[PDB]
Amino acid sequence: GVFTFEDEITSTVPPAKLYNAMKDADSITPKIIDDVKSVEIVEGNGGPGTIKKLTIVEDGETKFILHKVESIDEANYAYNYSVVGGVALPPTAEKITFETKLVEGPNGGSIGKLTLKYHTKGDAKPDEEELKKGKAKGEGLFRAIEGYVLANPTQY
Ligand SMILES: Oc1cc(O)c2c(c1)O[C@H](c1ccc(O)c(O)c1)[C@H](O)C2
Ligand SMILES: Oc1cc(O)c2c(c1)O[C@H](c1ccc(O)c(O)c1)[C@H](O)C2
Ligand code: NA
């Protein structure tokens, strides 16, 4: 089954600037997010199909997460990626897709439109705990990118 959820988050940063920084999330997030230690490309060049290995630290234990780049839509400020393996993927789940799209905020800032698609195996339903962790991670990244941009204004 596929379970779909929608959410919104705002930023002072304008969408073109925030999107360009999002494209560099692999190099940004290990720096700003304490739990994230590294992001390595295992397959592809960074485009759709590209597989990344994230090394994370949680409760003093090292764990890995696998992401697949689903789509990149520069024209629409859209970045889509799925969790396809590791600790962030419950056994019931086939995969979890995170869709981000930026649109202009009323005051020159940004609205981040988040879509979460949780793909279950069979008639399994999503784990709520895993879900809370996801949606959080949906923000915690957005904030990382935004904080980086605000802290390094020349960069973008
Ligand atoms: O607050 C967090 C905590 C995390 O463990 C993670 C967060 C944010 O975002 C990371 C992240 C998310 C998306 C990326 O494209 C990426 O390179 C890194 C990852 O989901 C792991
Ligand atoms: O398109 C996919 C879908 C998956 O479920 C996976 C994909 C790619 O690749 C992962 C993967 C994991 C480690 C690798 O070195 C590698 O090249 C690919 C894993 O097999 C799980
Ligand atoms: Na870190």
Side-chain angles (χ1 to χ4, degrees), residues 28-38:
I28 295 170
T29 57
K31 297 176 180 173
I32 179 162
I33 305 176
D34 195 57
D35 293 349
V36 179
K37 301 311 172 181
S38 65

Side-chain angles (χ1 to χ4, degrees), residues 10 26 30 36 40 47 57 67 80 84 87 89 120 136 148 150-151:
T10 60
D26 297 354
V36 179
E40 312 162 17
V57 171
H67 284 189
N80 297 338
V84 294
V87 75
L89 191 67
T120 57
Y148 188 86
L150 290 172

